[PDB]
Design a protein around this ligand. Sequence first.
Ligand SMILES: [Cl-]
Lengths: 487, 488
Amino acid sequence: LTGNVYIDGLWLPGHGAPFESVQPVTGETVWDGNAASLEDVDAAVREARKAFLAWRRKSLAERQAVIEAFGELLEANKEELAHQIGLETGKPLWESRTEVAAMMGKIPISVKAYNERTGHTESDVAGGHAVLRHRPHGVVAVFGPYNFPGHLPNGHIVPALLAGNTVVFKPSELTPGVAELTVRLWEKAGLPDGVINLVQGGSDTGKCLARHSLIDGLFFTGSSTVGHLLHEQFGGQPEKILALEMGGNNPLIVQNVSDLDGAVHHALQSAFLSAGQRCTCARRLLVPKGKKGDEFLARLVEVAARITVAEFDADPQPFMGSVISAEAANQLLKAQAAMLEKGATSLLEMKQLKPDTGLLSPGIVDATGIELEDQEFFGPLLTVYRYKGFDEALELANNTRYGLSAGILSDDRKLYNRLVEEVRAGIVNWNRPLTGASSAAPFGGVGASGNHRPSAYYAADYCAWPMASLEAGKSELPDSLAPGLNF
Amino acid sequence: NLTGNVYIDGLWLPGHGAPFESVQPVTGETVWDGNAASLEDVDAAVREARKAFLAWRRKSLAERQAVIEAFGELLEANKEELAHQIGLETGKPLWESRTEVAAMMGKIPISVKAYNERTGHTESDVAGGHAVLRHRPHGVVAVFGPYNFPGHLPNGHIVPALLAGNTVVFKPSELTPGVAELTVRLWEKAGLPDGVINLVQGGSDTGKCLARHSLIDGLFFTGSSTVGHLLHEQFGGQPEKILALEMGGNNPLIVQNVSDLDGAVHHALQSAFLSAGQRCTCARRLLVPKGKKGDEFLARLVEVAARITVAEFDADPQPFMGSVISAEAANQLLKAQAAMLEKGATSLLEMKQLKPDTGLLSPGIVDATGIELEDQEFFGPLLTVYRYKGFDEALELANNTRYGLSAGILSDDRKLYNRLVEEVRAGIVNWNRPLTGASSAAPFGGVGASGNHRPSAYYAADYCAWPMASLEAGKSELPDSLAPGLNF
Ligand SMILES: [Cl-]
């Protein structure tokens, strides 16, 4: 809890301008420090590069041993890291602890992924003895988002380090504290100097890191806009591997359910968990027009209006917490303002619960005939579209250039089978919340949600490249020579 | 038997662009004439492939696989005629053209294995419910073919892409249009539905229209690193389209400490001059220890290289290698070795044009041990030698390049191979096998300027289908332990 950059094993003040992290409800300072400057960033990359030569030489078992020791340290400090997450984002403690448990779960599954997707295998083949192993890239810049400031950055860092890369970690300027605490745990774990490097800052720092000509890869979790800027910057430099994990405009269908509340639970989870700041949150809810659908929205609006929202450490825990800042909440109110002026109708009003905070109540708007923008965003603002044929549900589900999550709640397995056959989305759930995903499977969207470098289970794929060998044992003439070969 | 016609949505039709021909690199006679696909020919191929995708993605894997295997049976039934068209139009001797066709066939069973392992279907019970993983095709993929292996390399994209449920608009090299037309005809006799594959012949105008068309979902490219980088920059800002680049290299072969001289000279000759040095993985730089034991190697290596035979693809006894792809290419290869000598290098074996306006080149070996030459990929039988002192000096020379496709070592000493493997930044790395040796049962991709981390062969599946992961329950119903703040 010092505010220092971390480079080649040493905590030092950054040379850039000071900034602070403020608690989204109380507005008080939770973290202050200096942004890393151009030459700090250059120093982190240059040192990460140096450490790479030795860190890649460790066995897989040596690198893994440090990573699980980091996992044991996560366990030993679970509550303190959960408390930092809650402080700096607004996420309630009950749910912050969930992020830390996932950071720990990331470790054994990454180890499994590495051996299966980028492991070591051997065969006797036509051209000789065949050997396949995978190699790290070098220095990878990791950019963290603010919604999951431990789990998501960790979802890059663990597979990247496990494979023999070194990391320059640039967290969001909204969650530097959680990151600094995480890197301190990597240190307590015994990670060698330079193998991980923390460079705090905002937009200047990230640009300096993104453009540094000596990073070998860049792993990004964050907004689709900035990720597209990154992809265009890297255009013409295929030598650097780029992994982009972006947002979505995720639809949830609800048609033909026999358990009213059970569906209203999964529907509420999908849209409002983490105050609607999970990348896979349902933003468009597709409900059948008329009789068979109207009751669902009523029980859903009833139960959604009883959602509790308070400080991350409320005396009894709330379901969800504040949005990231009082500003963010501000445009969320402008967002739903724009919608109604556009012709949509309010089912449940999103309200700012405390004067200058990010504490927002759930909001539900019906835009069934209204044309709204195709825009990713974080916040508890759910839009409903009513439809007639289930073929109309499919058409609306795909009415977006995003492609992250999609889902259906229904008793009828075949309505789910049709969605799976038709929807262009990376995660697609049946009778589970959209926000539920399995780190034991790939986690990536298509369309505007990725660049075909899915993460979680497939992170192994972008953390190490393949090297294939044909071995003989001694160069010697073959039994049948080729014509023209005269010895 | 060959018309020159574009193939779109099941119909062979004349192209609307300008006429061109494909000429025999030795004989100079016309081997293929036709019209380039025009802007609107290309647009029609893409729109139709897009239309066909909707149904082709709905066929089962077993149905798609059945057609692809029928294609393989047809490759076998027509082995010799496809070998003859490859050899006629590239110059490659029949004996090795037959080898390319065998590789087209081997591509099929190995692609099926790859698909089920890398982009298949699996299921689990996990914390969040019942877990199911599937993979989906991208849509319409443009395939750009090279001229060196005009069947095997294009086939390495097309079989995995078709198998996964994609449709293809195939733009072959303007130097090998015949081979592509004959291949696409075999796809037709195989029963591929209308529009699932589309042939669009042409040169650079045709290729630009396809590469730049806003309705392709993917582009799979094998060819020069320069054009592959232009493509990557073209796609900059369009992460929605998957781009797969298989490019050239500046590949080093190290030979140190071999007890079987000829055995080592054989693998070194294969590495540098097989296919007249037009294989992507050919050795371009030969790194030999300075002094006694290496001088003998270079001496024996020069002797045997000078008795390599080079002739027409159909010579009465087969030559070891044939013509390079064209007289222009041969022209630029001769200018390359001239520049080397003018730079201070010394000629060990002169590459010579065997017949005035052809691509017939004799093997060439140049020693640039103290000279600084450019870091450049190229196809042609021109090998540069560097002499070195410590094996660490070999390592520094091998990695002295922005490419990263192949690297290898001939040696008795396994630990010299182990150091190479630990240090070299290259996609394929062989020990005591020619550099030109690769296994379709393993990934095939270079790093550095030789790829964009979408290796092909076994891993082609990875860019041919995207993952869709599901958590299933069967009925939405409240959990045993609720979360706080949800009042019922
Ligand atoms: Cl190894």
